[PDB]
Amino acid sequence: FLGFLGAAGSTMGAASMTLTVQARNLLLTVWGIKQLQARVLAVERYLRDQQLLGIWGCSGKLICCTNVPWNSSWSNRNLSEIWDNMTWLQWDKEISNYTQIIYGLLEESQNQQEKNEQDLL
Amino acid sequence: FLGFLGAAGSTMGAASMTLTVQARNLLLTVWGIKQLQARVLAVERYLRDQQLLGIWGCSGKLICCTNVPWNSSWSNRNLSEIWDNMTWLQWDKEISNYTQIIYGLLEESQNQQEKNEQDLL
Amino acid sequence: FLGFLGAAGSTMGAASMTLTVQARNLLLTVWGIKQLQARVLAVERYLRDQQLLGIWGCSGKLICCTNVPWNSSWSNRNLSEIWDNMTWLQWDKEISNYTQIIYGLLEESQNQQEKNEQDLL
Amino acid sequence: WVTVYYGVPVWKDAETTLFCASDHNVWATHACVPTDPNPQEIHLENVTEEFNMWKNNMVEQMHTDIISLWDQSLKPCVKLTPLCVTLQCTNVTNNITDDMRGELKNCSFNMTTELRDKKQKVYSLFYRLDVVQINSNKEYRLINCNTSAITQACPKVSFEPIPIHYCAPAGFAILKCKDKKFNGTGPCPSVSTVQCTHGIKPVVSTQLLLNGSLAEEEVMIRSENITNNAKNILVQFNTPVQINCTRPNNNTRKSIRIGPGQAFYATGDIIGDIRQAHCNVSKATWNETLGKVVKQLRKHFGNNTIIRFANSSGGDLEVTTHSFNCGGEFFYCNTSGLFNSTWIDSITLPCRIKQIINMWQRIGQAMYAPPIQGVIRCVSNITGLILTRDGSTTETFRPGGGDMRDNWRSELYKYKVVKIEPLGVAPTRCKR
Amino acid sequence: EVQLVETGGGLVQPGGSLKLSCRASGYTFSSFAMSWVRQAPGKGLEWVSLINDRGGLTFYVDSVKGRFTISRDNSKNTLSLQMHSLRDGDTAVYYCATGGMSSALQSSKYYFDFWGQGALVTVS
Ligand SMILES: *[C@@H]1O[C@H](CO)[C@@H](O[C@@H]2O[C@H](CO)[C@@H](O[C@@H]3O[C@H](CO)[C@@H](O)[C@H](O[C@H]4O[C@H](CO)[C@@H](O)[C@H](O)[C@@H]4O)[C@@H]3O)[C@H](O)[C@H]2NC(C)=O)[C@H](O)[C@H]1NC(C)=O
Ligand SMILES: *[C@@H]1O[C@H](CO)[C@@H](O[C@@H]2O[C@H](CO)[C@@H](O)[C@H](O)[C@H]2NC(C)=O)[C@H](O)[C@H]1NC(C)=O
Ligand SMILES: *[C@@H]1O[C@H](CO)[C@@H](O[C@@H]2O[C@H](CO)[C@@H](O)[C@H](O)[C@H]2NC(C)=O)[C@H](O)[C@H]1NC(C)=O
Ligand SMILES: *[C@@H]1O[C@H](CO)[C@@H](O[C@@H]2O[C@H](CO)[C@@H](O)[C@H](O)[C@H]2NC(C)=O)[C@H](O)[C@H]1NC(C)=O
Ligand SMILES: *[C@@H]1O[C@H](CO)[C@@H](O[C@@H]2O[C@H](CO)[C@@H](O)[C@H](O)[C@H]2NC(C)=O)[C@H](O)[C@H]1NC(C)=O
Ligand SMILES: *[C@@H]1O[C@H](CO)[C@@H](O)[C@H](O)[C@H]1NC(C)=O
Ligand SMILES: *[C@@H]1O[C@H](CO)[C@@H](O)[C@H](O)[C@H]1NC(C)=O
Ligand SMILES: *[C@@H]1O[C@H](CO)[C@@H](O)[C@H](O)[C@H]1NC(C)=O
Ligand SMILES: *[C@@H]1O[C@H](CO)[C@@H](O)[C@H](O)[C@H]1NC(C)=O
Ligand SMILES: *[C@@H]1O[C@H](CO)[C@@H](O)[C@H](O)[C@H]1NC(C)=O
Ligand SMILES: *[C@@H]1O[C@H](CO)[C@@H](O)[C@H](O)[C@H]1NC(C)=O
Ligand SMILES: *[C@@H]1O[C@H](CO)[C@@H](O)[C@H](O)[C@H]1NC(C)=O
Ligand SMILES: *[C@@H]1O[C@H](CO)[C@@H](O)[C@H](O)[C@H]1NC(C)=O
Ligand SMILES: *[C@@H]1O[C@H](CO)[C@@H](O)[C@H](O)[C@H]1NC(C)=O
Ligand SMILES: *[C@@H]1O[C@H](CO)[C@@H](O)[C@H](O)[C@H]1NC(C)=O
Ligand SMILES: *[C@@H]1O[C@H](CO)[C@@H](O)[C@H](O)[C@H]1NC(C)=O
Ligand SMILES: *[C@@H]1O[C@H](CO)[C@@H](O)[C@H](O)[C@H]1NC(C)=O
Ligand SMILES: *[C@@H]1O[C@H](CO)[C@@H](O)[C@H](O)[C@H]1NC(C)=O
Ligand SMILES: *[C@@H]1O[C@H](CO)[C@@H](O)[C@H](O)[C@H]1NC(C)=O
Ligand SMILES: *[C@@H]1O[C@H](CO)[C@@H](O)[C@H](O)[C@H]1NC(C)=O
Ligand SMILES: *[C@@H]1O[C@H](CO)[C@@H](O)[C@H](O)[C@H]1NC(C)=O
Ligand SMILES: *[C@@H]1O[C@H](CO)[C@@H](O)[C@H](O)[C@H]1NC(C)=O
Ligand SMILES: *[C@@H]1O[C@H](CO)[C@@H](O)[C@H](O)[C@H]1NC(C)=O
Ligand SMILES: *[C@@H]1O[C@H](CO)[C@@H](O)[C@H](O)[C@H]1NC(C)=O
Ligand SMILES: *[C@@H]1O[C@H](CO)[C@@H](O)[C@H](O)[C@H]1NC(C)=O
Ligand SMILES: *[C@@H]1O[C@H](CO)[C@@H](O)[C@H](O)[C@H]1NC(C)=O
Ligand SMILES: *[C@@H]1O[C@H](CO)[C@@H](O)[C@H](O)[C@H]1NC(C)=O
Ligand SMILES: *[C@@H]1O[C@H](CO)[C@@H](O)[C@H](O)[C@H]1NC(C)=O
Ligand SMILES: *[C@@H]1O[C@H](CO)[C@@H](O)[C@H](O)[C@H]1NC(C)=O
Ligand SMILES: *[C@@H]1O[C@H](CO)[C@@H](O)[C@H](O)[C@H]1NC(C)=O
Ligand SMILES: *[C@@H]1O[C@H](CO)[C@@H](O)[C@H](O)[C@H]1NC(C)=O
Ligand SMILES: *[C@@H]1O[C@H](CO)[C@@H](O)[C@H](O)[C@H]1NC(C)=O
Numbered sequence: 001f002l003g004f005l006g007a008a009g010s011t012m013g014a015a016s017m018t019l020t021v022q023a024r025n026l027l028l029t030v031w032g033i034k035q036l037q038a039r040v041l042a043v044e045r046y047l048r049d050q051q052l053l054g055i056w057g058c059s060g061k062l063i064c065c066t067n068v069p070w071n072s073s074w075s076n077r078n079l080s081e082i083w084d085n086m087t088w089l090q091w092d093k094e095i096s097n098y099t100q101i102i103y104g105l106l107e108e109s110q111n112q113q114e115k116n117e118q119d120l121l
Numbered sequence: 122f123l124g125f126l127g128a129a130g131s132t133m134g135a136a137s138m139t140l141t142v143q144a145r146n147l148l149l150t151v152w153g154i155k156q157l158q159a160r161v162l163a164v165e166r167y168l169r170d171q172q173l174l175g176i177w178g179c180s181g182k183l184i185c186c187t188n189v190p191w192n193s194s195w196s197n198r199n200l201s202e203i204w205d206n207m208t209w210l211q212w213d214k215e216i217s218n219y220t221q222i223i224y225g226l227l228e229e230s231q232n233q234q235e236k237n238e239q240d241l242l
Numbered sequence: 243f244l245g246f247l248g249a250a251g252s253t254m255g256a257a258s259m260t261l262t263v264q265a266r267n268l269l270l271t272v273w274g275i276k277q278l279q280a281r282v283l284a285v286e287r288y289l290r291d292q293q294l295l296g297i298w299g300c301s302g303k304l305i306c307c308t309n310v311p312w313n314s315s316w317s318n319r320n321l322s323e324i325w326d327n328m329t330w331l332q333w334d335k336e337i338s339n340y341t342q343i344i345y346g347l348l349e350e351s352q353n354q355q356e357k358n359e360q361d362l363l
Numbered sequence: 364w365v366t367v368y369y370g371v372p373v374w375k376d377a378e379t380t381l382f383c384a385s386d387h388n389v390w391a392t393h394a395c396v397p398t399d400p401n402p403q404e405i406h407l408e409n410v411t412e413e414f415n416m417w418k419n420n421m422v423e424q425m426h427t428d429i430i431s432l433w434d435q436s437l438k439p440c441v442k443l444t445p446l447c448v449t450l451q452c453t454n455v456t457n458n459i460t461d462d463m464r465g466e467l468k469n470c471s472f473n474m475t476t477e478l479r480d481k482k483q484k485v486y487s488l489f490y491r492l493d494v495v496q497i498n499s500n501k502e503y504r505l506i507n508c509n510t511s512a513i514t515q516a517c518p519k520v521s522f523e524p525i526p527i528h529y530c531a532p533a534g535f536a537i538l539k540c541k542d543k544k545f546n547g548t549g550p551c552p553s554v555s556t557v558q559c560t561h562g563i564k565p566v567v568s569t570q571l572l573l574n575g576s577l578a579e580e581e582v583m584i585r586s587e588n589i590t591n592n593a594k595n596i597l598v599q600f601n602t603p604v605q606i607n608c609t610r611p612n613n614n615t616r617k618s619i620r621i622g623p624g625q626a627f628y629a630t631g632d633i634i635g636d637i638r639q640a641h642c643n644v645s646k647a648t649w650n651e652t653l654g655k656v657v658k659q660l661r662k663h664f665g666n667n668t669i670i671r672f673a674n675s676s677g678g679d680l681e682v683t684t685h686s687f688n689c690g691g692e693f694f695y696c697n698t699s700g701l702f703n704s705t706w707i708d709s710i711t712l713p714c715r716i717k718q719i720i721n722m723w724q725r726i727g728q729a730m731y732a733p734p735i736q737g738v739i740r741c742v743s744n745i746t747g748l749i750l751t752r753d754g755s756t757t758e759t760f761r762p763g764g765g766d767m768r769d770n771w772r773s774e775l776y777k778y779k780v781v782k783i784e785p786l787g788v789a790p791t792r793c794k795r
Numbered sequence: 796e797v798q799l800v801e802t803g804g805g806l807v808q809p810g811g812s813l814k815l816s817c818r819a820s821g822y823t824f825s826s827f828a829m830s831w832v833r834q835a836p837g838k839g840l841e842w843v844s845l846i847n848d849r850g851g852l853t854f855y856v857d858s859v860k861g862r863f864t865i866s867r868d869n870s871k872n873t874l875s876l877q878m879h880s881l882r883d884g885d886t887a888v889y890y891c892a893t894g895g896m897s898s899a900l901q902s903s904k905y906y907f908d909f910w911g912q913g914a915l916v917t918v919s
Contacts, residue, residue: 002405015372019368020228025536027168043165043285046168047269055262058367059181066366067795092784118305240852
């Protein structure tokens, strides 16, 4: 089918089947420095996202189901609109202002279960 | 016992007990650039293999058991020959032409179970 | 509350609730080389610790419960002293001489269960 | 309810460092990544993206990269410091036509030798634009002597504008707008993702854009603000106009040793007749082309408006003329024969030649262009114009230029660089 | 308007096997989960099996768990149910129905929206 970003205009539930397509595309001394800086940055950006998935308990996954409830104030829409009408670019704009709140909540719930799992052992 | 690559001449099942031995060995401005390029490359190569294990569902493992059947056309041999007679260098030559097919199948089966696991939750 | 290293003077069990605080802080051509070397090193140090957690079976976790027994010769103290009186800086000094022994044991027990888990499948 | 996805096809505008790739150059030689023989392009269905060619930092990057590469290619070459001497000059009158009477000067001077103890008397030909009369009526100095050091370009490095492909680093992507009739700003449909840009030739010129790409259907007028007379108008042709330029003088070159391992390349006597350099533009083609340009200008200025073309305003030769580099020599051609009309064989444009070149718009770094032996003939495509509007029933357009960024903006207008942001969250209906 | 049409044999011996099938039309087949429900000759309804819209997940009632297979083919718009072993207690009308589950990225159902007319199976 289409490769990298081919699903960009597709709906969210049509997309999200192509997650490995995008994940794999994230990987004279003056020209040397410019190229190394570009390569070092690609590595650093990749690792920051991986660390973040790790602290949320989603390490090694592309689709991670969490234990944080959705607040209707973040987006009062049903699943039919979100997954069948909207694209990911549109969604990202709609909930931009709630991203940091959601991220904080994801970290907190992982810390709590990580500890509960120790008490049960 | 022997360290890095010590098991190279050993059979596949004698080897594969030494996986941590090899895994741990993967980690004037002109000399500066040459050394940084070597270090940056070592990091990039390491991360590509880790990403690949991740999309196959083998993150965090050295021995990963998958859900893809073996096609006898890739190598029509039994377990006794593969694990007790052959070395890993010999095996790699024998199935070189099927590596990309196998990798594609591993990615596909992970995508399918990753989705089934969401439907069950 | 306090941020990075804020818990440094806290006891071990008061600390160890702040693990994500510290984990997130680990991330003219001559000035170019100096800065790149600092950035490349930060990446390499991060990855060595992650590889090590991986071979011990603790990938993706901040608190990992293992299957290696504690030898009283490493530190003959009870849990009350270790978790309620001591700080992590004090503890690190107390068991510095046993760190490599413990690390070797952690690798060995993971290799054994990684293999047992294959036989059971 | 909250679920986390990684690998989500989302992006944001971004500014990054792009690297060069390509299939004895001034620019890209071995410090350039070999290209992919089968590069990818992915059409994005249902994607509308906003582009703005006037805010495109790929242009600023290219400008910086070509200047830096230019300098690195002069750095190891011969310094001509010993040449800034008093010259004794007379006129070249041997078989000189009227068109060049007084254009070439025959100058003698006392040059250094391999040995510090000895001097040599040598002579060479210079163009009048390369020298300044001082004081003794035959005494001259080179034009750059009171301004800057001059170096000689190494005569092994060509100036041929071999194309460069710009490629994005991982985590970034280049989006291409394929919408025909795209005027440089606003949204456009028909967006595709590419690994790298097409090959863009770093052709350096003023007034007329040479050897670039063509418009897909019709002549297009692009500007930052079409009603602002302080802004330039870039005109892209949908058909080329062929232009043939030449220096019809059989030159010879001589090497003067000036030091232990260094030599100056001087122009020797001209073989045969001496004639003026010039460029030929087919008249009918130019007239048809200009036809199309006016038809499109009227869309912005009125279809009952009188549109006049006029030659350039006064100022520095580097701006008022059509500058280009061909065959290894720098030409300054007079375009008043192209821009002289109300509304809308061959047209011959006379040209001047210089040896001392101040590149870009810098002061302090001059270069000497070694002469080229034999006769130079160039054939190239005019692919567009840079116009400035002079300004209630009529408008006057004149040739403009000199700011090299306008010559790259015309090729990079289709590209945008974005950053990929693979994480996202959404509600779903599952629970860990 | 949608239709579900059950086909398949209606008379078998105990100890044998039987395949039933259900052709669907009038809706996107691939968008719905499907199931089979039995109607005993003189009693009520019983759920037997459920299959996911993609065909990857199947569920069974314990009484047929080691005997029946539910399968789906989204290219032909059909379901099938393969019975094995067969008991006298399995005599029933077998209804093809649309519904039963959900796809976790859309609203849940947990009810049956459409029913076919049912194949009658008698075990002798
Ligand atoms: C617009 O594009 C056209 C073509 O796409 C381009 O014209 C080309 O210019 C080059 C350089 O002037 C021409 O190549 C030269 O042809 C002469 C013919 O006698 C040769 O002698 C030259 O070789 C000498 O110089 C070389 C420099 O490295 C040496 O390596 C060599 O040994 C010789 O010394 C050289 O081949 C080329 O033929 C034309 N192309 C065509 C089709 O005529 C034009 O210049 C571009 N316009 C602009 C303004 O850039
Ligand atoms: C270098 O010498 C040139 C030539 O004499 C100077 O340029 C002239 O400056 C006068 C100032 O009134 C102008 O009228 C002339 O027309 C200029 N000549 C040319 C050819 O442009 C130049 O300014 C001198 N540079 C410095 C730094 O003194
Ligand atoms: C430029 O001037 C030089 C002299 O400075 C001319 O060269 C001389 O030409 C006469 C003609 O017979 C020769 O006898 C001399 O020996 C030449 N001198 C040298 C140093 O070679 C030269 O021809 C003039 N060039 C032009 C184009 O007029
Ligand atoms: C460019 O070429 C034109 C055409 O040959 C030159 O035009 C001449 O300019 C002088 C200046 O007053 C006029 O008296 C002539 O009548 C003009 N000729 C024509 C045909 O118009 C023009 O000067 C050249 N430009 C430069 C800067 O040299
Ligand atoms: C001037 O423009 C023409 C038209 O674009 C160029 O000729 C084309 O070159 C491409 C190269 O692949 C061919 O596919 C086209 O068929 C050519 N067109 C024609 C009509 O032959 C021409 O090469 C350009 N000249 C220069 C000097 O670049
Ligand atoms: C683009 O929109 C049309 C609208 O019907 C849709 O059918 C098509 O599949 C969309 N493109 C992609 C890649 O889904
Ligand atoms: C949902 O968000 C609002 C503010 O946007 C907050 O007051 C409310 O408590 C949140 N819901 C829950 C369950 O925390
Ligand atoms: C739920 O989906 C229906 C479909 O028409 C839509 O009208 C309704 O507004 C949606 N719910 C919300 C909260 O918007
Ligand atoms: C969302 O998708 C459904 C699918 O039938 C369609 O009917 C509905 O009109 C779509 N809504 C929008 C806003 O496109
Ligand atoms: C996000 O913040 C901007 C700031 O002005 C605001 O305009 C926008 O509406 C906010 N988004 C939402 C979804 O409320
Ligand atoms: C090398 O081959 C011999 C053959 O018997 C075998 O015994 C020996 O163990 C092999 N080497 C290693 C490292 O196993
Ligand atoms: C095994 O490989 C052959 C081709 O090498 C292919 O035709 C066959 O279908 C494969 N087996 C399976 C189960 O796909
Ligand atoms: C299975 O092992 C035996 C051992 O002698 C060998 O002869 C036989 O050829 C093997 N099977 C295959 C498929 O080669
Ligand atoms: C494989 O190992 C077995 C172990 O007994 C041995 O008998 C057999 O000959 C070996 N085959 C080869 C090809 O070395
Ligand atoms: C792999 O491809 C090469 C190409 O010539 C072929 O010779 C070789 O036999 C192939 N390997 C196998 C196992 O078929
Ligand atoms: C510092 O020591 C005092 C001793 O009582 C303790 O109460 C305090 O909480 C300690 N600081 C931190 C950060 O815990
Ligand atoms: C504990 O350590 C001592 C040496 O410090 C060692 O002899 C002893 O065997 C260890 N205990 C166990 C269970 O291995
Ligand atoms: C256990 O805790 C008590 C608390 O007073 C302490 O006295 C005792 O020494 C501890 N055990 C060890 C092994 O030190
Ligand atoms: C350890 O904490 C307990 C808590 O009650 C305290 O009583 C004890 O004195 C502390 N020991 C030391 C050495 O501080
Ligand atoms: C660790 O080794 C040093 C070396 O002198 C020794 O002094 C120290 O006591 C050792 N630590 C322990 C806990 O035994
Ligand atoms: C002019 O050209 C002719 C061509 O042969 C040549 O003989 C003559 O000497 C030239 N005149 C001068 C002054 O060089
Ligand atoms: C050279 O020709 C120009 C033309 O105007 C004249 O003014 C100048 O005096 C001539 N020079 C000599 C040295 O004859
Ligand atoms: C070269 O130096 C001599 C020294 O007397 C001088 O006469 C002569 O004019 C100089 N040559 C030139 C061209 O200035
Ligand atoms: C370019 O197209 C956009 C599309 O809306 C338009 O707004 C803009 O004014 C156009 N540019 C000019 C110079 O008219
Ligand atoms: C275009 O130039 C005119 C000239 O004054 C100015 O008023 C107008 O605001 C400019 N357009 C924009 C978009 O700023
Ligand atoms: C330009 O046209 C004139 C007309 O005679 C011709 O002589 C001349 O050679 C042409 N120049 C070029 C570069 O073709
Ligand atoms: C340029 O030269 C070509 C032949 O190389 C000729 O056909 C063409 O007409 C010339 N163009 C002009 C404007 O003379
Ligand atoms: C340009 O084309 C127009 C079309 O009517 C014609 O009248 C005019 O004379 C042409 N100009 C030249 C220079 O051929
Ligand atoms: C200019 O062209 C437009 C195109 O629709 C036309 O409506 C308008 O009347 C024309 N103006 C004149 C002065 O003819
Ligand atoms: C433009 O044409 C006029 C005609 O009088 C001439 O005087 C002027 O110098 C020309 N300008 C240029 C830059 O050639
Ligand atoms: C400009 O057009 C006028 C019209 O009479 C003509 O006389 C003049 O020579 C033209 N100028 C040039 C430079 O061709
Ligand atoms: C230049 O003159 C030399 C003298 O023999 C001749 O061989 C050469 O071909 C001439 N060059 C050209 C381009 O005519």
